Design a protein around this ligand. Sequence first.
Ligand SMILES: [Cl-]
Ligand SMILES: [Cl-]
Ligand SMILES: [Cl-]
Lengths: 598, 598, 598
Amino acid sequence: DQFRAIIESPEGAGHVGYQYRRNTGSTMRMVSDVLDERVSLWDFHCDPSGNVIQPGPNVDSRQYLQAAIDYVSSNGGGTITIPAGYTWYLGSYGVGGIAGHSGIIQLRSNVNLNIEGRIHLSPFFDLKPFQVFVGFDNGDPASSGNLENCHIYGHGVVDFGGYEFGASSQLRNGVAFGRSYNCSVTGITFQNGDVTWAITLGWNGYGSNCYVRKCRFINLVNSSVNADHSTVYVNCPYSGVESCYFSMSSSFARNIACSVELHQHDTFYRGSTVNGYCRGAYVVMHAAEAAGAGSYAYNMQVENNIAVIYGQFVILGSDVTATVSGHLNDVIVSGNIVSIGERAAFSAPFGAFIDIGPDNSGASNVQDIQRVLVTGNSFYAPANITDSAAITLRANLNGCTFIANNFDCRYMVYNAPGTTSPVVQNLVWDKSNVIGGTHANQRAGQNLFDMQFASVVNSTIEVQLSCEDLSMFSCILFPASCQLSYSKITVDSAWTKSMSNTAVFEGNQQAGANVYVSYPATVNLTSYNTQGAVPFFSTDTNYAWVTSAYSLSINENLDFSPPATYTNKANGQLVGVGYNEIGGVRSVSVRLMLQRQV
Amino acid sequence: DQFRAIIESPEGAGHVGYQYRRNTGSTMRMVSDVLDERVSLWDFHCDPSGNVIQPGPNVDSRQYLQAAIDYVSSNGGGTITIPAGYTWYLGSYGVGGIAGHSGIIQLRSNVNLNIEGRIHLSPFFDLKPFQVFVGFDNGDPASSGNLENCHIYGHGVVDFGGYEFGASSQLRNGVAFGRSYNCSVTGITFQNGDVTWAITLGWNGYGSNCYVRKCRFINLVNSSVNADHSTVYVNCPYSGVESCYFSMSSSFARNIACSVELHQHDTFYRGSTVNGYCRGAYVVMHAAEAAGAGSYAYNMQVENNIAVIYGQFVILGSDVTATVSGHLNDVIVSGNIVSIGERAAFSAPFGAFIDIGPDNSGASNVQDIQRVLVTGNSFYAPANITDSAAITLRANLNGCTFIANNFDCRYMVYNAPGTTSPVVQNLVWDKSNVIGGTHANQRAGQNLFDMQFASVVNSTIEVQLSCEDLSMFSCILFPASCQLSYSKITVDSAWTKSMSNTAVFEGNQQAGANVYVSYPATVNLTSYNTQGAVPFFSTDTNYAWVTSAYSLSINENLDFSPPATYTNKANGQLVGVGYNEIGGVRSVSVRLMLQRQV
Amino acid sequence: DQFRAIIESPEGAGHVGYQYRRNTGSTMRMVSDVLDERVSLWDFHCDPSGNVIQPGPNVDSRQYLQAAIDYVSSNGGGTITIPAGYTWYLGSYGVGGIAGHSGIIQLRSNVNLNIEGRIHLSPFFDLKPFQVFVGFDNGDPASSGNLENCHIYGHGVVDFGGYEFGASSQLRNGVAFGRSYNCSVTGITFQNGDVTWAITLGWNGYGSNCYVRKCRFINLVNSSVNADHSTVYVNCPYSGVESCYFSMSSSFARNIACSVELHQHDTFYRGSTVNGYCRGAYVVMHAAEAAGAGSYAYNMQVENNIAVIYGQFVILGSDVTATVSGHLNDVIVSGNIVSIGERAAFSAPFGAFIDIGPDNSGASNVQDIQRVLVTGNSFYAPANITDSAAITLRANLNGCTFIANNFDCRYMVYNAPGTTSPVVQNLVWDKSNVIGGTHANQRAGQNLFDMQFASVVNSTIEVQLSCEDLSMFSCILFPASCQLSYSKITVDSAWTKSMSNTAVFEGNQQAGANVYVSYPATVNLTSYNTQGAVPFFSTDTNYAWVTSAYSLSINENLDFSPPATYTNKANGQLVGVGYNEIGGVRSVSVRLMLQRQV
Ligand SMILES: [Cl-]
Ligand SMILES: [Cl-]
Ligand SMILES: [Cl-]
């Protein structure tokens, strides 16, 4: 039977006619033509005889998936389905350009992957480096062509097989898109591994419009060998992460894992949830990555995320090379709800909402960070966590503005004494920042705002308490080593009546010509003997810098009243005019708001 | 013709060969194999003879859809398409585990539903309870297995057929995912019903990563019989609702319908639009639902939503059982634009942006709600709506912070007199909250901040007006029954010059040792006869609590000037030193800012 | 061979049997039936003989795509795939109802387009108007039926072919959905054109639930002929744009292009990135578009966007017709990070974060704009850009509230002198707005807040500097032509000690009965000769409006002290009681905070 032979052969479908819904106005097609409108891994997952091979732990599907990608690429692109209901194992490295990146699969432009099933790494990869999907087409990224219009999506899973790193110097990634333009990962679960990154977008600023959306990243650090982990590394502009879920359960992740890094301009991290990580996001301009999009990381957004972390939520940085200086500016951090998870004090990296960090080599004098707006966020750390701050300011800062946040942690501004001595400019802490009381009574020997810096200039710190904490040493303290100029420092009187110290200037810095300061203090006064209007003067002479002061105490006397307001004198005394109904020298102790130029 | 018989039989496609795009490197497949890569309801919507049955109002498609789900489940999962261009009717209950939930269809793990057509409930369900899709596999949820990786998506519709409830005690749901992990509904329109919920995620904290995105919910309450409605009920952590649309047209919905409830930690409600509902979202930790994820609802986000409602936007709550206490903390409500739709005063539940509500049995002394941040929202209620407040504070509150909102409604803080007497702690109303003027001139006999509580502690109320309203009785009023301690209460002077009362303390609570207060008042003063510096004293003796006061009035005199500032005396008089150019007893009425410890 | 003939004919697939995965419980189907579950352009892209035609620059695919849409529509809807790996060219106009709109393709209800390949306009369209996809079904939109449930999505591209406009009066659009309900565009790249709009949603308020998500719009303006461009025009309620990318490279776009317009209630623009445009979004209620959804545009959201623009970020407007008055209210602008790109001063439309604009004919006295909340945004303009303002207030304003923003540009509030004279009501500029220092030293002859208005009422301007700028003429200036009443104007003293002018009232408006003002000034005082308590009086008589004043200077004297606080006298002098330790007339120059009713 000749016709039988033709129909049963691989060309059979090309001899069965078809017309859509019997529409005589439709194209006269062959069944093969219609089936050709889709493509799956099954169309390439065959032995050399063309007989299909079933996937499984005993089968390496790499070559077949590569063949599919290669073939679809040469036809101008399309979408390859990785079928649901099966697990497809990868058990060897790819070859060519991706070899230099320990690549398994090479992605190609215009070839999308619809992962509905599961992709799983075989034991071959135990203790070895790997990059599962690689978009570079040359071992030297600088010589690589671009990856364009490559989208990975579906309800499927990329499982890294649980293998630990073999050595800390190794690198592992899920999707390394390369010099990627209009590439994305959507809907995929990345799980069960010990990797450096799950997804990297771009290369040294080369790339654009790359996005990670609605993905899950689960348990991607599992050993002490893993040197560092950032789940999504965004290294091209006009790119970002949205509506993802990141979770770690390993102890090690709490010390080394960060959910996202934003390294280029016009990048974002929004609407995501993080649990079990050390850090939320690094927002940094590394000068070594400035080739593709310039040396300025601007228009950076971290918004509307939810996190439980053990270290720092947002870490800001910038650094230089011999010929390039990195700059970070125009950043917004807003609408995030973040808490330091339960842990012993000092058992993980210092808890912080914002960290101004030193560069990779520890340099704290190379940063150019400014025009950062931190607003409308909530931060919480349990009362026992001494190492928790709204901002750990450890390197030079050229500007950061805090407005309308709620910070409930040990410190508001902090830098460790005897460590770095940052130069701080344009730090603005608005009075609308609400300071929570979880750490009330835990602050013996501590300063709420601990200004351990070389210098502070053009800065504003408006301290507003909302409950008492009589355990703290001071609300704000400037060591003698910290220069302060052209700045405004105020401590609102509410909840401070019983505090011994409110603002402390160990170098008498509040006397600066362009320092604007106000804070409460207790002052002893005596008067002359005169009946009628009579001056009261301070006993002490430590007020030569005071422009005015006013009473914060009642006067429990009938026969006299001290002045409501005071100026100073050349010798450093305060002086005001009170009233003696009857004559006599008076002596009183009063709580005063001391003011300088405000 | 033997070959003809084989080809025309159901095994025919298994005898037609195919090779993708004639690629000799591709798998030699049978047409049947390629068609097997997809599956639709048509593959199971047949009579016992295997002859296809057309769907319609006269056909019950339930058994066929169940057969499809069951079959795909046993093959490890996949996606079943519910074809476009047809309406598929359901007209009977399912059986087994879902029977205890009035279930129609039982969902199974890894089996997704791509609903492109319409699913419609037949009259069989009129006046009866139903749950359209159920993920539980046992009548007892505590004994049920988990539903994993189940996604419902598409451009289709679930139509509840418009049937009213038969009785208020009945329950109705669209998708009850059960103990659901990685389940979602995306893109679907749920419409035309009288239901309790459209979608429930999780069960008593069991579940994770469940999401409702880009769905529409239209007219899901239509009768007086419906007891309660919440469109999406989120009862598992790490789950949420994003970019949905909720609309009701029925009068009944304005009294009973809420768009979302968030019941577990790390849940969110963002970027959605609501119209015609009573309420926006309940954000509550019910102790009875604490089994799967603990008794703390933390990291709760309500952000960037748009709403027109008739009752309350966000309702906060927590309650206890005999052995479990619920806690709600670490909540952020921000970026929402909300208005109370046009309605007569008192014709719907009391209008509010935030409501601190009593539990289901009316208890107002069981709540543990704190660390709530409400910032950057806009709220509006038409001028006639007496029952409108920024916050209705009706049950115990342990903390809530308001910063940088615009509230344009009748009351800022309100609790009805003669009802509950909440214990309020850590209520912070920052001065940056802008109080709109829509209700100006409508406040006869009313207090803008009506502090009808048992006690207020560690709280801040900084009242800042932005226009005049001389109709109000006071800006803030504390009844004698309200204890006040360790708190800051201030009324800015702007727009208050002509107000008879600014802050009113009916129990003289402003005299508290740790109360920090300032507000304007008019005070009559007289002076002694002395030429030169001369004291002025208040006629009245109601100022024993005042630490200082200063003039808010000009002095229209040449021959004397009253003091700019004043202290007090033991008898409760104010006293200051003014100046008589010429002697004579003086008498003046002055507007003063009265201050205590500020 | 009869059977061969049947199988090879277009009816062949209808004679090959199939049963899903050989399941005897599945439907006995024909291969044709299964293939009929999907449909693509290939099923209609054939010559009259039914022989397929390959697409290309030489082939007009319009008629074939229209045939596909028409056919699928008549079957109750479905999704037509536009295949990947091919470019489909359109080279002629459609006919019928869409002819009046220069339409190419007519969309139909329930017919979705999955664009995976590329759609490209042929040279036929060079210099001509066109609307690529049109949802109207009648040349007269008022007589058109509705377009419902039409979704365009995929990884594909709509390329406008780079053709310039032939004339400025022409119009061009990508997708004009018409009276559109539940329509959307998702994932598509629109590129390479000179168009008026890329996408229009709704028609004069008719429509609902239309969304543009995850789309890219690249280089859609390229000539001087193009009169105006707005990429997405939202003209139906309950609709919006989310997570899109907009980029222009042409010089012309910097002068005429806007990314989005929001024209109806309950609309939004969120999470998008814009580069190279003149403007971000117009948020306007045009009375001429009030038919479908009323004359009020309320619940308008512009949130969490990132932009580099050359003109104005958000432009607010409303206008009237003979019988309809437009109103704009209940708007929120928050979480946006925006910068004016590098450009010469005055080389593009005046840089602004918010612009209150005149109507299309230049009218500035027809607007009804109120209840606008601008919070938590960051705005930056390089130092050379004189024409940069937080708000350019050029038309009547009934309310706008600014809280917790960071504005780093030349002006905070600005209107050009000698142009319009707006009536301003309910403008609130909270003290929590942080004023950046990029323009410090560039403000010679300029007023930071330049209040060039006819009148200001019920407004608040709380100026808070965060660094010095001694170049500016004043912090705030009211010309004599600007009435001011029932308003609060304050200038915080920090960074102002060396300023010659702080607040300037050229018409002495600070003396108003209901004006609440405070600002620093230098005042010369002399005293009487009296030993002991002694009055000091100002030499000048310009303080008849001052209610109190206090010292902002130290007293570098031992023998006397001036008063800490002052009142006034009828003749306009300040007066206070100081102290002469030793007698003698004293003369001092002091910096004072002058206060009126605050
Ligand atoms: Cl200084
Ligand atoms: Cl107290
Ligand atoms: Cl006035």
